[PDB]
């Protein structure tokens, strides 16, 4: 569970496990893909999805799921979790705003991006419907199964950590977690590299003038920008994607019906939609005289139909069509 | 090469709320320790009661929990019970192995005194078909768990040949211990009164055989 | 934590004054004001006023506006009560307390008064070892009877207080206009009379202490 | 100006759940009277165990609640406990000063029976030497706290001489008193046998000096 | 901690400890300063600001935070209590509805203020992001150590408590909470001022046409209006703010960069930006002949550059210049 | 309780027993009545209309209420509930979002429905205040003493229950909740209607090919179109609706006051509101010439008054009126 | 037309944890049973415990509670107590009917032993009017509940005329029993010493007359 | 609070009715309804239906449908199981309760019937004194002998009720076609015989009741 710099974090710019990337509004029913710098899913080692690993200090913290929150404008709907990233139906927002509740503490995380939800269809929505037409909208997956990308997941580098850089009674005292890789001098010429297990510091005794950090890439991360890389190589670690965008026919918008009225040669439409839907026609001579316009006010229009025939399409309603003789 | 440390020995009564507390030499306990409590009752029994600083193992009591209180972890047993008359260890994880603590031993009232049960028998006689003759004389079920054991071949106290183990827990939470005086074949058919003299808590019980 | 701990009991004749001290531990005195209760040998329990130990100002119950003055060693920790031309009526016992969460939580030992007239006549201090035959059992008991002394209180320990456990000290009780109090320790009958065991006891009204090492009868 | 009501005793047995009440002759009692509950338990020993009505002082057991149950403040002790037996003090407040009630004495149902430990001493020779003789019996751990003492001189029941102190709780919850039987050194030196008899929960105890 | 008449409590009016007045959404950062009628800071006595003591009764309750919720159109975060007053980051809303959680009841309060977050900037942002330039914001503080300006707060008036006006088994009966002062009469004649400890009353006997009143000016108030004015004098309390506007930078906006395109003495500029944004020129000859438009939706513009120069200003991104020789 | 057809219940359409029906964001007051499915109110037998009765399983839950939630765009606020039906006071909302606690699971229900609110005035608000003018508003009530109109309610259809169709060790096993009338038959010829106890089935074995079915009519249900029909008859049960439609005076809008400015014949108003105000005049001539504008941006307006006089109606304040000779 | 199952007998000791389940012969339990639980304390003495599935009967210790485990109901007693000895029972709902379980016999370890007390009456006289005679014999306050009685006229075991009740059980939950032997007038007034022998927990007290 | 009372227990020969009343106290009867439910002797427990206070209209389980008939005088809170033409397996114990909870919270005492043929033959009731010779402790043992009766069931008090700690009451038991009881009472030995000590008897059945006072054997 990568940890990453959250940038309004309740307060401000926190570090939070679950710093927020890589917002994706670009579907279409109400979801998101999200990745936080928190791998929930399984535990550390190997059970059940629906429990969750952030980082606390250096160390993950394998535990329940208990109290997850995304949330924008107004509240969302989790999805489903896999890996690093969440998959959440929310509704349109300014920001994206994502938070669990570990029990002692909030401990939330939030962002800015650009979100909305047009259906697809001729009609403007802000919001699935229960009923409607099925046609084919752009949607993620609820699985994990998935293979169908892969982003790049090398190492991490390296960390800080000033608990390690204790006093040794006058001198500054570094530790190790578990015999990692701790790299360490401080601003006086003392020990230059550090790959070690607990050393002390002969020279410098100020822990604010100290290289306090954590070489421990026993576990890969996602290459978040707002991680520092890992110097030494290119790490393996190539690492799938679960939530890919499918081709879902999302249950979908449809808007009344027109009225349709006669005259000569002339369609009056007293129209009267739920939502801003684009009506457009196509007088079917070699002079095609199209017409578009959004409608979400109700209007009476007027279309002058010629001899050998116009269609009329009601939002994602079929395409009508029409003999004026 | 760090060092947890915890109390020694804390005594409690039925009912109390005690506190025992396991400090690390390297700096304040935190989170990233997962503090663990275990703890051990009598016949090497290790059961483990916290996890994770506060996270109470499935079926212990919630008489029990933990937290960190100040710069270390603490259990707080709230209700001690006499059952809790044990000794708990702490642990703490530091990036790549564990540190336990010394323990505490802890005593909780309870458990009203109980006085022993002795018994003394003859060396047998397949026994004394060997050119030896062992008496050995059994204690059970005695509580406080301290006694002492005297032998008296024929009035006097014998003071050589004797060996008496030490009070070692049954599962009720009592003691037992045996005591064996070693003759001969010989010494054994020559003094004619053999005497187990128990003293516990304040009584004494003698269990005399007669050859 | 806290420890309210006040002054000893004391004996004083009608028209007298006294003060009562109470020495606060554990807590800032400053943010914890200290209220008064008075407990009367059978009334039960009465607030008698609060003193602000931040300001000074004192609250009197109706009760206890006159004869009765708060006041304090802020410096040391103390709030005292000062009963002054006591009445006879005034023997109880009195508490300090310190008023927080919404109430009383900590209460001190008490201090009890007993306005009474008489002289001064210092104890008579009697070794109590057991019976000149035998006493033979796992333990022994032994005591210590402090005899015919005025007024109250006297003070009584055992081995200059380093014994404690096992003693029963018994209630100072009013008998032919003399006090008389005893006490009984008891300890393994490889103690006593191996090691020394001494009752010690003050009566400070007449500035009498009496270091008495129990003996054997023979 | 205004007088708090409470029961005057209550009996309960370890374990149960009991409700005490506090009651306001002005009023219902209201979240404004910040209703405290105190205990007092023998020795002139006070602490404070609910305030501001419900608010339980630090280090009281949890089995303690406060509420307001109508019109008046309660206390709930939840599993009643032996060492509950003590008596409760409501306290009310009325915009500038307090008003405690009478208090409530609660016999919790526990602590077995002890039998008294009696012991009578003969007047020492320091006291002999002042033409005086006192025989004190000392009677400590007994419960019930309720014994009879009686003297007889010679054979014959003294009616004349003694004071018995009234039964004192001591810190373990069992009672202690003393008699006195007060002669002159020569109603010392007459009668030849003295005899101190204590009578609890039945069994008598009788504990005799022989000059 | 005052209590006062919230407007639409839950059901409607009711008189709530955490009656809202002064809702000033007057800053930029997403804040507002709001005053409960509750005084939540330290207890009664003396600890923790994070504790909270509102008016239940005649009587304070200085407990425990656990759920406070300020809310708008979503719900808030809070920034800081201190005294009567909290400051909480809340997004735009035609309403303010701010609540606790007592834990027996959900005890809320909610008003009507029109609110807005305008960032500072030619941008017009619904919200702060994590990045952007730094520019002077109008913004309220974290902290309480704060002088900077001081509202009255003098005593309260009396107030009603009925609880007290029992009966004395045929006449109504007063009492008093500590000693205070209740003043007192019915519309019969009786006892007519009412300086006192628990009095009855001889004349009346309703409980529906007496004086239950409490003179308890042991602590000052807020001088909400509404309160009744405690009529006998201006008392002292001159009490400060801490919650001073103050000139904070925020982490500010920023608008996409523009599409320069060359023509003859013409910018063409195709543009595209994340939120509207004020852009605007200034043809730097004696004749100024200036521009302003708000530009939301992305747009290809035209500016005749003159010979000497133009400037251009793509949002609160620094002003740009330019030779058109 | 009824249990129908939710359509976007978390995931997707499940089955909710607080299947959301007939959405009515019709009055003016914040409030929308809502039918769930469910009947809440009092238990199964007596008690406590603040008691929580759904349908789990084909049995009842009559449990406590402890965490409903209705909620929009934002989180509503509960009025009362009464049967079936609920009233909530909801901000406006593309949706409507309805859902419970039940204690280990969310187990919400939500739904499309086009809800605002117009307070009743020329004054178009988002919200109510706290303040203006009271006057005849659209509202429902808080209360259940109420008969102005009943719905029909007569029984339930059957409803599937394939717990039943449990195994007879070779032969799949029909049972009876209570005696309950089970109306069964296979895909093979077996047992023809199904009025009966626990029977077994000689001839199929697949329970995917069976009747598993409930004629439980001993309680009547709502008539919800997510209902299938009881095909025997149209039983009794007309049942009322609490929550008429009545004629509430809801505390309601009012504008800031006008800046009446002079000039000959000529009303020069700056004018500057709270929200979008529909101002309209009236020159009294019986030429009419009157107007009618939304005004929400301030504005600086004018009015050629007459000799005989001009009226003024600045938002639902009361109108006015002006002598211009 | 269903059947509920539940445990026949568990035994627990003071202060453990037990749980006890209710089967339903038709499929899992679920809510919509609305799970009941009974508990019968001797002299036919029922109290409801918990109700639709896990609502405690009000003044019923919290040490009780209910819930749905896998797919049965059950019962779990948190810190068992000797007081819970009894028989508990499940109940069912199924749409039309209740169905009770068959009660699970639970036995908490406490209580400590108690001897029993007895007392043997002659015939009364009134009685020996009627030309008969019946020696009455009552044995009260026993624990565990189990005796054995045997009468010995003159010395010999009388094993014929006697008659002994089943061990009943008292309020404090310690048991009681009477056993009469029956002889006549004259049967009476021919042998001369009579006795009632009670066994109980390893001790035996015997009760004789003379007449 | 709520209590629910039963009437005695009775006996009755095959063929013979029953009415078994239930007096409900603490609650509202209109708002809860009653269980009834038969505990056979050996059996366990079993519903026998249920009956709406409120409309009056019973559920009856299907094994108790015919002769089982429950009623309620409403008006006195009261609910009633009358048992027709009772069969001699009807032998049982039957307890009214109260549904509530969504179960049932409270359960009445019981009333108990024993099916059986038999007359009517009146008690017997003898005194138990202690031995005639000494019987000197801190406390004295009574007792109250209740022979050859029928049917069931007797009624036994001491001291008109007043006296009922200490008490012992055995139940009946059939013994060559007659019942049989008995009951000891233990007091301090100063009560009796100083104190007068009574058994009071009564056999409903025969209309018979006995005071008969314990007197000393000599």
């Known amino acids: 569970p990568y940890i990453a710099d959250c940038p309004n974090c309740g307060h401000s710019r926190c570090d939070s496990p679950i710093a927020i990337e890589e917002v994706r509004g670009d579907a279409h029913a109400g979801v998101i893909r999200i990745q936080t710098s928190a791998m929930f899913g399984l535990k550390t080692d190997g059970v059940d999805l629906a429990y969750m690993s952030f980082m606390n200090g250096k160390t993950q913290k394998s535990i329940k799921i208990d109290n997850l929150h995304v949330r924008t404008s107004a509240p969302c709907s989790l999805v489903s979790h896999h890996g690093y990233y969440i998959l959440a139906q929310c509704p349109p927002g300014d920001t994206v705003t994502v938070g669990f509740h570990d029990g002692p503490n909030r401990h939330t995380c939030t962002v800015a991006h650009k979100v909305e939800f047009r259906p697809v269809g001729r009609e403007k929505y802000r919001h699935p419907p229960e009923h409607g037409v099925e046609l084919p909208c752009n949607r993620y997956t609820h699985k994990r199964a998935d293979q169908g990308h892969y982003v790049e997941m090398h190492q991490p580098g390296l960390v800080a950590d000033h608990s390690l850089l204790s006093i040794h009674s006058a001198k500054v005292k570094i530790t190790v977690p578990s015999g990692a890789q701790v790299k360490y001098y401080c601003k006086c010429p003392d020990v230059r590299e550090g790959i070690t297990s607990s050393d002390h510091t002969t020279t410098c005794t100020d822990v604010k003038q100290c290289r306090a950090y954590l070489i421990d890439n026993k576990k890969w991360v996602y290459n978040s920008g707002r991680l520092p890389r890992g110097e030494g190589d290119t790490f393996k670690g190539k690492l799938h994607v679960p939530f890919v965008p499918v081709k879902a026919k999302c249950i979908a918008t449809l808007a009344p019906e027109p009225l349709v009225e006669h005259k000569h040669r002339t369609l009056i439409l007293h129209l009267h939609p739920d939502h801003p839907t684009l009506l457009t026609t196509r007088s079917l001579g070699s002079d095609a005289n199209p017409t578009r316009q959004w409608i979400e006010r109700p209007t009476t229009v007027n279309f002058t139909v010629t001899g050998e025939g116009l269609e009329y399409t009601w939002g994602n309603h079929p395409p009508k069509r029409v003999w004026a003789q | 090469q760090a060092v947890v440390t915890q109390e020694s020995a804390l005594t409690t009564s039925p009912g109390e709320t005690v506190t025992l507390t396991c400090?690390?030499?390297?700096?304040?306990?935190?989170?990233?320790?997962?503090?663990?409590?275990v703890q051990e009752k009598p016949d090497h029994f290790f059961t483990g009661?916290?996890?994770?600083?506060?996270?109470?193992?499935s079926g212990v009591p919630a008489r029990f929990s933990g937290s960190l209180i100040g710069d270390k972890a603490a259990l707080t047993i709230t209700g001690a019970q006499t059952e809790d008359e044990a000794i708990?260890?702490?642990?703490?994880?530091?990036?790549?192995?564990?540190?336990?603590?010394?323990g505490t031993k802890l005593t909780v009232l309870g458990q009203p005194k109980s006085s022993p049960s002795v018994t003394l028998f003859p060396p047998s006689s397949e026994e004394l078909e060997t050119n030896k003759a062992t008496l050995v004389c059994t204690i059970t079920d005695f509580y406080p768990g301290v006694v002492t054991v005297d032998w008296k071949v024929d009035g006097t106290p014998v003071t050589q040949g004797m060996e008496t183990t030490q009070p070692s827990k049954q599962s009720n939470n009592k003691y037992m211990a045996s005591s064996y005086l070693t003759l001969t074949a010989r010494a054994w058919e020559r003094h004619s009164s053999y005497s187990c003299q128990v003293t516990h808590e304040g009584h004494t019980v003698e269990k005399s055989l007669s050859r | 934590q806290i420890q309210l701990v006040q002054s000893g009991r004391e004996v004083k004749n009608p028209g007298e004054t006294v003060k009562i001290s109470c020495?606060?531990?554990?807590?800032?005195?400053?943010?914890?004001?200290?209220?008064?209760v008075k407990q009367a040998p059978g009334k039960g329990f009465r607030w008698?006023?609060?003193?602000?130990?931040?300001?000074?100002?004192?609250?009197?119950?109706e009760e206890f506006k006159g004869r009765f003055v708060f006041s304090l060693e802020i410096s040391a920790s103390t709030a005292y009560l000062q009963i002054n031309n006591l009445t006879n009526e005034d023997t109880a016992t009195?508490?300090?307390?310190?008023?927080?969460?919404?109430?009383?939580?900590?209460?001190?030992?008490g201090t009890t008064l007993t306005v009474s007239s008489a002289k001064t006549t210092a104890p008579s201090v009697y070794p109590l070892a057991p019976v000149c035959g035998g006493t033979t059992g796992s333990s022994v008991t032994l005591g210590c009877l402090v005899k015919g002394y005025f007024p109250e209180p006297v003070t009584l320990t055992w081995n200059s207080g380093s014994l404690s456990s096992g003693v029963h000290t018994f209630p100072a009780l009013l008998q032919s206009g003399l006090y008389t109090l005893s006490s009984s320790v008891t300890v393994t009958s490889n103690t006593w009379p191996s090691q020394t065991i001494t009752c010690n006891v003050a009566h400070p009204a007449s500035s009498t202490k009496v270091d008495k090492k129990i003996e054997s009868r023979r | 100006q205004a007088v708090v009501t409470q029961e005057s005793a209550l009996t309960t047995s370890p374990g149960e759940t009991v409700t005490l009440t506090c009651?306001?002759?002005?009023?219902?009692?209201?979240?404004?009277?910040?209703?405290?509950?105190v205990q007092e338990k023998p020795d002139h020993f006070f602490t404070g165990?609910?305030?501001?009505?419900?608010?339980?002082?630090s280090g009281v057991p949890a089995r303690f609640s406060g509420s307001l149950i109508g019109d008046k403040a309660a206390l709930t002790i939840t599993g009643a406990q032996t060492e509950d037996e003590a008596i409760?003090?409501?306290?009310?407040?009325?915009?500038?000063?307090?008003?405690?009630?009478?208090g409530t004495k609660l016999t919790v149902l526990g602590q077995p029976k002890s039998s008294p430990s009696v012991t009578l001493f003969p007047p020492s020779s320091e006291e002999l030497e002042t033409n005086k003789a006192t025989l004190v019996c000392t009677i400590t751990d007994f419960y019930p706290g309720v014994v009879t003492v009686d003297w007889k001189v010679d054979g014959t029941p003294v009616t004349q001489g003694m004071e018995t102190t009234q039964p004192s709780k001591q810190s373990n919850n069992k009672y202690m008193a003393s008699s006195y039987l007060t002669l002159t050194a020569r109603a010392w030196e007459r009668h030849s046998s003295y005899s101190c008899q204590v009578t609890h929960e039945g069994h008598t105890v009788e504990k005799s000096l022989s000059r | 901690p005052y209590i006062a008449d919230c407007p639409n409590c839950g059901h409607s009016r009711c008189d709530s400890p955490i009656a809202i007045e002064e809702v000033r959404g007057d800053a930029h950062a997403g804040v507002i300063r709001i005053q409960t009628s509750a005084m939540f800071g330290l207890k009664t006595d003396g600890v923790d600001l994070a504790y909270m003591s509102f008016m239940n009764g005649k009587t304070q309750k200085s407990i425990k935070i656990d759920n406070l919720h300020v809310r708008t159109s979503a719900p808030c975060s809070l920034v800081s209590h201190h005294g009567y007053y909290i400051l909480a980051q809340c997004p735009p809303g035609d309403t303010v509805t701010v609540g606790f959680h007592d834990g027996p009841n959900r005890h809320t309060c909610t008003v009507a203020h029109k609110v807005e977050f305008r960032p500072v900037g030619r941008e017009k942002y619904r919200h702060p992001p994590e990045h952007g330039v730094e520019l002077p914001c109008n913004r309220y503080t974290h902290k309480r150590a704060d002088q900077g300006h001081y509202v009255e707060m003098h005593q309260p008036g009396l107030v009603a408590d009925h609880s007290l006006l029992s009966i004395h088994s045929a006449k109504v009966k007063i009492t008093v909470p500590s000693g205070a002062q209740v003043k007192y009469y019915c519309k019969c004649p009786d006892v007519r001022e009412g300086i006192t400890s628990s009095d009855h009353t001889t004349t009346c006997t309703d409980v529906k046409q007496c004086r239950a009143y409490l003179i308890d000016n042991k602590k000052w108030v807020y001088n909400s209006g509404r309160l009744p004015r405690g009529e006998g004098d201006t008392f002292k309390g001159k009490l400060h703010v801490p919650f001073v506007p103050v000139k904070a930078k925020c982490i500010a906006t920023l608008a996409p960069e523009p599409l320069v395109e060359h023509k003859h003495r013409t910018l063409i500029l195709h543009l595209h930006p994340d939120h509207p944004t004020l852009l605007t020129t200034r043809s730097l000859g004696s004749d100024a002949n200036p521009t302003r438009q708000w530009i939301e939706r992305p747009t290809t513009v035209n500016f005749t550059v003159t010979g000497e120069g133009l400037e251009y200003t793509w949002g609160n991104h620094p002003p740009k210049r330019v030779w058109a020789q | 309780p009824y249990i129908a057809d939710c359509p976007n219940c978390g995931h997707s359409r499940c089955d909710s027993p607080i299947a959301i029906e007939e959405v009515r964001g019709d009055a003016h007051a914040g409030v929308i009545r809502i039918q769930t499915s469910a009947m809440f109110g009092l238990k199964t037998d007596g008690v406590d209309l603040a008691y929580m009765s759904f349908m789990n399983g084909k049995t009842q839950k009559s449990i406590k209420i402890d965490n409903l939630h209705v909620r929009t765009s934002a989180p509503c606020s509960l009025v009362s509930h009464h049967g079936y039906y609920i009233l909530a006071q909801c901000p406006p909302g593309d949706t409507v979002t309805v859902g419970f606690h039940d204690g280990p699971n969310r187990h919400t229900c939500t739904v499309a429905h086009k809800v605002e609110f117009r307070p009743v005035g020329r004054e178009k608000y988002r919200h109510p205040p706290e303040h203006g003018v009271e006057l005849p508003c659209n509202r429902y009530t808080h209360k259940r003493a109420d008969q102005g109109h009943y719905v029909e309610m007569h029984q339930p259809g059957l409803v599937a229950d394939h717990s039943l169709l449990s195994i007879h060790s070779a032969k799949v096993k029909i049972t009876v909740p209570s005696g309950a009338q089970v109306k069964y038959y296979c895909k093979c010829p077996d047992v023809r209607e199904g009025i009966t106890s626990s029977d077994h089935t000689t001839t199929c074995t697949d329970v995917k090919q069976c009747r598993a079915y409930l004629i439980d009519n001993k309680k009547w249900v709502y008539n919800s179109g997510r209902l299938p029909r009881g095909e025997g008859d149209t039983f009794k049960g007309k049942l009322h609706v609490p929550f008429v439609p009545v004629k509430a005076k809801c505390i309601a809008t009012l504008a800031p006051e006008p800046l009446v400015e002079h000039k000959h014949r000529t009303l020069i108003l700056h004018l500057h509101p709270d929200h979008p105000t529909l101002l309209t005049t009236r020159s009294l001539g019986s030429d009419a010439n009157p107007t009618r504008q939304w005004i929400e941006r301030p504005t600086t307006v004018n009015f050629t008054v007459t000799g005989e006089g001009l009226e003024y109606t600045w938002g639902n304040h009361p109108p006015k009126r002006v002598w211009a000779q | 037309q269903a059947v509920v199952t539940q445990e026949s007998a568990l035994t627990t000791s003071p202060g453990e944890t037990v749980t006890l389940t209710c089967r339903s012969n038709?499929?899992?339990?679920?809510?919509?049973?609305?799970a009941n639980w009974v508990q019968e304390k001797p002299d036919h003495f029922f109290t409801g415990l918990i109700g639709?599935?896990?609502n405690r009967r009000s003044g019923v210790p919290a040490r009780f509670s209910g819930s749905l485990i896998g797919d049965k109901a059950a019962l779990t007693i948190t810190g068992a107590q000797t007081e819970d000895e009894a028989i508990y029972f499940c109940?069912?709902?199924?749409?039309?009917?209740?169905?009770f379980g068959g009660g699970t016999k639970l036995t908490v370890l406490g209580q400590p032993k108690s001897s029993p007390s007895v007392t043997l009456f002659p015939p009364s006289s009134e009685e020996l009017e009627t030309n008969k005679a019946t020696l009455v014999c009552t044995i009260t306050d026993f624990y565990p509940g189990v005796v054995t009685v045997d009468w010995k006229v003159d010395g010999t075991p009388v094993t014929q005329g006697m008659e002994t009740t089943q061990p009943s059980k008292q309020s404090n939950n310690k048991y009681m029993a009477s056993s009469y032997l029956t002889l006549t007038a004259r049967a009476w007034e021919r042998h001369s010493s009579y006795s009632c022998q009670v066994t109980h927990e390893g001790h035996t007290v015997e009760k004789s007359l003379s007449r | 609070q709520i209590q629910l009372v039963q009437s005695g227990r009775e006996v009755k020969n095959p063929g013979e009715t029953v009415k078994i009343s239930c007096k409900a106290s603490?609650?509202?009867?209109?708002?809860?309804?009653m269980l009834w439910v038969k505990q056979a002797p050996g059996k366990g427990f079993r519903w026998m239906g249920l009956?709406?206070?409120?409309?009056?209209?019973?559920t009856y389980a299907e094994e108790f449908k015919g002769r089982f008939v429950f009623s309620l005088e409403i008006s006195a809170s009261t609910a009633y199981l009358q048992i027709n033409n009772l069969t001699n397996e009807d032998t049982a114990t039957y307890f009214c309760?109260?549904?509530?909870?969504?179960?049932?919270?409270?359960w009445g005492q019981g009333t108990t019937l024993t099916v059986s043929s038999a007359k009517t033959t009146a008690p017997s009731v003898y005194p138990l004194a202690p031995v005639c010779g000494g019987t000197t402790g801190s406390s004295v043992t009574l007792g109250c002998l209740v022979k050859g009766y029928f049917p069931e069931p007797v009624t036994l008090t001491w001291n008109s009720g007043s006296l009922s700690s200490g008490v012992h009451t055995f139940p009946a038991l059939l013994q060559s076609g007659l019942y049989t009881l008995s009951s000891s009472v233990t007091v301090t030995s100063n009560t009796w015989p100083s104190q007068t000590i009574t058994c009071n008897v009564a056999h409903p059945a025969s209309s018979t009741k006995v005071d008969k006072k314990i007197e000393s054997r000599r």
């Open positions: 038709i499929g899992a339990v679920t809510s919509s049973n609305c």
């Open positions: 009956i709406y206070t409120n409309t009056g209209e019973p």
């Open positions: 603490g609650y509202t009867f209109t708002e809860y309804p």
């Open positions: 309760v109260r549904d509530y909870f969504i179960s049932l919270d409270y």
């Open positions: 109940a069912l709902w199924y749409n039309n009917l209740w169905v």
């Open positions: 639709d599935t896990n």
